[PDB]
Motif scaffolding. Structure first.
Motif, PDB file in Angstrom:
ATOM      1  N   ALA A 141       0.840  -1.189   0.000  1.00  0.00           N
ATOM      2  CA  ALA A 141       0.000   0.000   0.000  1.00  0.00           C
ATOM      3  C   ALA A 141       0.881   1.246   0.000  1.00  0.00           C
ATOM      4  N   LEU A 156      -2.618   0.076  -4.278  1.00  0.00           N
ATOM      5  CA  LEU A 156      -1.773  -1.055  -3.914  1.00  0.00           C
ATOM      6  C   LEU A 156      -1.020  -1.466  -5.173  1.00  0.00           C
ATOM      7  N   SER A 197      -2.162  -3.208   6.459  1.00  0.00           N
ATOM      8  CA  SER A 197      -1.403  -4.173   5.688  1.00  0.00           C
ATOM      9  C   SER A 197      -0.799  -5.185   6.653  1.00  0.00           C
ATOM     10  N   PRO A 246      -0.729   1.352   6.715  1.00  0.00           N
ATOM     11  CA  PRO A 246      -0.448   0.756   5.417  1.00  0.00           C
ATOM     12  C   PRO A 246       1.019   0.338   5.376  1.00  0.00           C
ATOM     13  N   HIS A 252      -4.357  -6.994   2.776  1.00  0.00           N
ATOM     14  CA  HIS A 252      -4.668  -5.576   2.923  1.00  0.00           C
ATOM     15  C   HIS A 252      -6.159  -5.327   3.132  1.00  0.00           C
TER      16      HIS A 252
END
Ligand code: W9V
Ligand code: NAG
Length: 765
Positions: A141, A156, A197, A246, A252
């Motif tokens: 990410a 992403l 993430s 992230p 994710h």
């Protein structure tokens, strides 16, 4: 050239919403790869979200309905979800954009509209969950400018061997994002899109719900630890909004909160393709896909009288799109009992108890991995491959896109073991296994299931005898291509044939049984006192008690269907030795159906056993079983036996109800007894075979031409109208229909062979 079409087909079909077990998700036809899934639910309290959140398909009072309004696996389509519990009408539009070397690109639009009954200010949590399996692949990410999450799009970037480079964008979207005036906002933001993430061991990535909740709970625990309490609590939605974290990982979570209506986009851009995919791309392709779907429908499923009207057209599109829209890709290990315990040979009286003892040894083990690309009977209740079901599903599908049908047939035959066995139910992977109790996962190499995929092959042969658009039919348009396909498959068809005759053989020689052939006699292995699951007709009454000397007329008819197709395909390939062996087997089944299965007294075919005094007894239960030779196309149009069966089909006091043919006669002692599954209800799959055979007799010279025409006309009418009436009232296709009331009953979203109705409506077999 065959190879070339093959690669173009592979690239065309690679990406799809091929996770029919969930409301909306994507995966490619690659075992260990990138998967996406959508979740949503209203949040009104501190404790409600866990009960409201939606992910895997179900059907209860809190869900009005859902399904595909339009779908083509090459192009994409549109799904509608009507959620009473969460007060939401949802639209998910999926579109494929071909290009590059890696299966192309795709995009989806997710649109939520509160219904009339919802609070105008409802808070709804939406999650897009993305996982990637594979040893060497990467997914990251891009972090936001902002401290606490994203004001704009979430990007992403990832790479794998199968997919090369790609980018997956979740857009900002339209709708009010609620803002919190709480203290907490100094640490968590006032409210914005967030990404977490993470990484888990590959084999648990499919468990999106627990993984998500484990994060929500850690968020809540963090609140408790940092002195946020009931003296002054943040609003529910903010308590359930993940802290933004992230990074890189194989999982994710993209989370958004909306007040009122929302919509947002998912854009998958394959780097190896042209420019990347935009929202404007998506809108255009969506419009275009609809147009193309519209035209193909009108050509392929042009509904004949009395179903020409726009109401039956909407109905037709719905039954069709849900059937083709059920197509899934599965991957993983299966649970198989490879003991071949001698008890499974079922040679003794009382065999069912022996076999239970072997099962109690629990020698089954995981084996694979296997993959399968197939359509399914039901998204909420049976979201996996069923052998004899798939024969029915492919008949409409093959009309739409013969190459697609052939892909699915290929996929099934690639499962076949060295002996010629394909398991009747394909539960592939821990994900697929989660929906099935342990006690029913195990497959048994001695269990057959009707070889209905041969009916699709018959349709394809007859078609062969007489860019997305092009690919759909390449296997008929290029005779060279069809034959090569049949060349490669033909060995497996024959292996299956031999396997039936080896493992499902009945006993002529060791009883006082006279018949034309000593070879041709069949008995389904796997029967219990009350059931015969392998036949497909779960609880249709069979000889009591079960017995090694039983013979089953349905099974013998299915062998007939097989030999006929092997004759046709054998000829096409010039396998002359083979064709003559088949010819004598067909001849022998024709005689042996009469010698062992025909009852002069009762006027129909029957199963047989052997008596207390060891002589052959016919055991007649008038119903679907009784017509099997006729259903399967084995009877000559001038046959007197046929005329007797037409009598039985037509007779209201036996099989003929206003709604279609009853599974069992009202006269049978077993009518509407026990679980009453196949003991009176109307089933579309068998009704379809009857309709198709009635039409065959109706459009040829012979003594029964006019009786058949009448029955054909009426039965087509009753079946379509019963399925249409229920669809209108309830929104659903049903597993079966009540012959007394016409009501749909048992399982909903059964598309499912109930969709054969699109073929019945459009006629001209
Ligand atoms: O009852 N369970 O043991 C069970 C329970 C769950 N479960 N319940 C709650 C959570 N999970 C899941 C699976 C099973 N499997 C055993 C099999 C009994 C049902 C068989 C019905 N077969 C018909 C549909 C079909 O099988 C497919 O269209 C056709 O092919 C046939 O022809 C039809 O007759
Ligand atoms: C599609 O192509 C890939 C790479 O060429 C191949 O490994 C895969 O098995 C193909 N899928 C099938 C069997 O249809």
């Amino acid at each position: 050239l065959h190879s070339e079409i093959g690669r173009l087909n592979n690239q065309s079909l690679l990406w799809g919403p091929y996770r029919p077990n969930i409301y909306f998700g994507t995966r490619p036809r690659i075992g260990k790869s990138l998967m996406t899934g959508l979740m949503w639910g209203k949040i009104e309290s501190y404790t409600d979200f866990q009960h409201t959140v939606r992910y895997t398909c179900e059907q209860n009072e809190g869900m009005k309905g859902y399904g595909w309004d339009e779908y083509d696996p090459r192009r994409g389509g549109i799904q509608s979800i009507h959620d009473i519990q969460n007060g939401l009408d949802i639209t998910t539009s999926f579109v494929k954009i071909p290009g590059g070397a890696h299966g192309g690109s795709w995009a989806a639009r997710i649109k939520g509209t509160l219904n009339d009954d919802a609070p105008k200010d409802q808070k709804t949590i939406v999650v897009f969950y993305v996982s990637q399996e594979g040893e060497n692949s990467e997914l990251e990410a891009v972090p936001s400018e902002n401290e606490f999450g994203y004001e704009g799009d979430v990007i992403l970037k990832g790479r794998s061997e199968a997919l090369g480079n790609y980018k997956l964008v979740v857009t900002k979207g339209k709708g009010v994002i609620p803002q919190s005036d709480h203290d907490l906002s100094r640490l968590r933001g006032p409210g914005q899109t967030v990404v977490q993430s993470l990484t888990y061991p590959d084999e648990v990535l499919w468990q999106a719900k627990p993984i998500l909740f484990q994060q929500l709970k850690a968020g809540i625990d963090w609140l408790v630890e940092n002195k946020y309490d009931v003296a002054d609590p943040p609003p529910p939605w903010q308590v359930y909004l993940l802290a933004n974290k992230p990074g890189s990982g194989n999982v994710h979570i993209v989370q958004k909160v909306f007040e009122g209506d929302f919509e947002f986009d998912i854009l998958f851009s394959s780097e190896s393709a042209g420019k990347e995919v935009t929202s404007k791309d998506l809108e255009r392709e969506v419009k275009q896909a609809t147009e193309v779907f519209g035209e193909r429908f009108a050509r392929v499923f042009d509904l004949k009288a009395p179903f020409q009207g726009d109401n039956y057209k909407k109905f037709g599109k719905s039954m069709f799109s849900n059937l083709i829209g059920g197509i899934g890709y599965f991957y993983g290990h299966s649970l198989v009992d490879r003991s071949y315990a001698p008890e499974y040979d079922e040679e003794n009286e009382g065999f069912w108890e022996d076999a239970a003892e072997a099962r109690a040894r629990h020698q089954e083990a995981l084996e694979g991995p296997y993959e399968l690309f197939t359509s399914i009977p039901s998204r909420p209740f049976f979201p996996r491959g069923f052998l004899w079901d798939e024969g029915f599903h492919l008949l409409p599908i093959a009309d739409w896109d013969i190459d697609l049908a052939l892909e699915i047939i290929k996929s099934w035959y690639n499962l076949m073991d060295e002996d010629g066995w394909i398991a009747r139910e394909q539960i592939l992977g821990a994900e697929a296994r989660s929906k099935v109790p342990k006690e029913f996962q195990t497959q048994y190499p001695h269990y057959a299931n009707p070889p209905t995929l041969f009916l699709v092959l018959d349709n394809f042969v007859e078609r062969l005898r007489k860019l997305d658009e092009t690919l759909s039919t390449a296997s008929v348009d290029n005779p060279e291509v069809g034959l090569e396909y049949l060349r490669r498959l033909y060995p497996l068809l024959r292996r299956q044939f031999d396997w039936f005759r080896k493992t499902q053989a009945g006993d002529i020689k060791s009883y006082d049984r006279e018949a034309y052939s000593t070879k041709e006699a069949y008995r389904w292995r796997g029967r219990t006192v009350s059931h015969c699951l392998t036949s497909g007709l779960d609880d249709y009454p069979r000889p009591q008690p079960p017995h090694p000397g039983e013979l089953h007329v349905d099974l013998m008819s299915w062998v007939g269907v097989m030999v006929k197709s092997l004759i046709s395909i054998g000829s096409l390939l010039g396998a002359t030795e083979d064709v003559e062996f088949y010819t004598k087997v067909l001849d022998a089944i024709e005689h042996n159906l009469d010698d062992l299965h025909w009852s002069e007294k009762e006027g129909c075919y029957c199963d047989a056993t052997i008596d207390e005094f060891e002589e052959h007894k016919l055991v007649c239960h008038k119903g679907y079983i009784s017509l099997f030779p006729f259903l399967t196309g084995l009877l000559k149009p001038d046959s007197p036996k046929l005329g007797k069966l037409l009598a039985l089909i037509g007779d209201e006091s036996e099989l003929w109800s206003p709604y279609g043919l009853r599974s069992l006669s009202k006269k049978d002692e077993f009518y509407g007894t026990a679980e009453n599954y196949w003991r009176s209800p109307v089933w579309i799959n068998i009704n379809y075979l009857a309709i198709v055979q009635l039409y065959n007799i109706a459009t040829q010279d012979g003594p029964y031409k006019e009786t058949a025409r009448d029955l054909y006309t009426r039965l087509r009418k009753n079946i379509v109208e019963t399925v249409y009436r229920n669809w209108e009232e309830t929104g659903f296709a049903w597993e079966q229909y009540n012959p007394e009331t016409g009501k749909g009953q048992r399982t909903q979203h059964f598309t499912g062979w109930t969709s054969l109705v699109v073929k019945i409506m459009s006629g001209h077999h």
